[PDB]
Amino acid sequence: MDFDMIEEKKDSVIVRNVENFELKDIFDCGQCFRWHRQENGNYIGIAFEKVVEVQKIGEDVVIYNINEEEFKNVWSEYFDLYRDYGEIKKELSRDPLLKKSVDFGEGIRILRQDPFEILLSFIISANNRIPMIKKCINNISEKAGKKLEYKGKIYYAFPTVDKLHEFTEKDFEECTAGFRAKYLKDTVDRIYNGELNLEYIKSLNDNECHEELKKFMGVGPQVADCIMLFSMQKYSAFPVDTWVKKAMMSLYVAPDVSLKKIRDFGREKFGSLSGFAQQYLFYYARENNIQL
Ligand X SMILES: Nc1nc2c([nH]c(=O)n2[C@H]2C[C@H](O)[C@@H](CO)O2)c(=O)[nH]1
- Tell which residue, 278, 281, 208, has the closest CA to residue 239: 278
Residues 16, 36, 88, 207, CA torsion sign: positive
3-state helix, strand, coil in the chain (%, to 5): 50, 10, 35
Per the CB < 8 A criterion, the answer to whether 135 and 176 are in contact is yes
Between 15 and 262, CB nearer to ligand X = 262
CB of 122 to ligand X, least distance (A): 7
Residue 53 pairs in a beta bridge with 44, 64
Contact positions vs ligand X (CB under 6 A): 30-31, 125, 127-128, 130, 226, 239, 241, 244, 278, 282
Residues 185, 135, 35, 205, CA torsion sign: positive
CB of 57 to ligand X, least distance (A): 27
Between 159 and 239, CB nearer to ligand X = 239
CB of 128 to ligand X, least distance (A): 6
Q: Is 43 helix (H, G, I), strand (E, B) or coil?
A: strand
Between 66 and 213, CB nearer to ligand X = 213
CB of 21 to ligand X, least distance (A): 18
- Tell which residue, 166, 141, 165, 144, has the closest CA to residue 155: 141
CB of 2 to ligand X, least distance (A): 21
Alpha-carbon distance 246 to 45, whole Å? 30
Between 213 and 244, CB nearer to ligand X = 244
Between 31 and 236, CB nearer to ligand X = 31
CB of 70 to ligand X, least distance (A): 26
Between 12 and 31, CB nearer to ligand X = 31
Per the CB < 8 A criterion, the answer to whether 35 and 44 are in contact is yes
Q: Are strands 51-57 and 6-9 parallel, antiparallel or unpaired?
A: unpaired
- Tell which residue, 252, 204, 259, 263, has the closest CA to residue 228: 204
CB of 238 to ligand X, least distance (A): 8
Per the CB < 8 A criterion, the answer to whether 122 and 128 are in contact is no
Alpha-carbon distance 108 to 133, whole Å? 21
Between 29 and 63, CB nearer to ligand X = 29
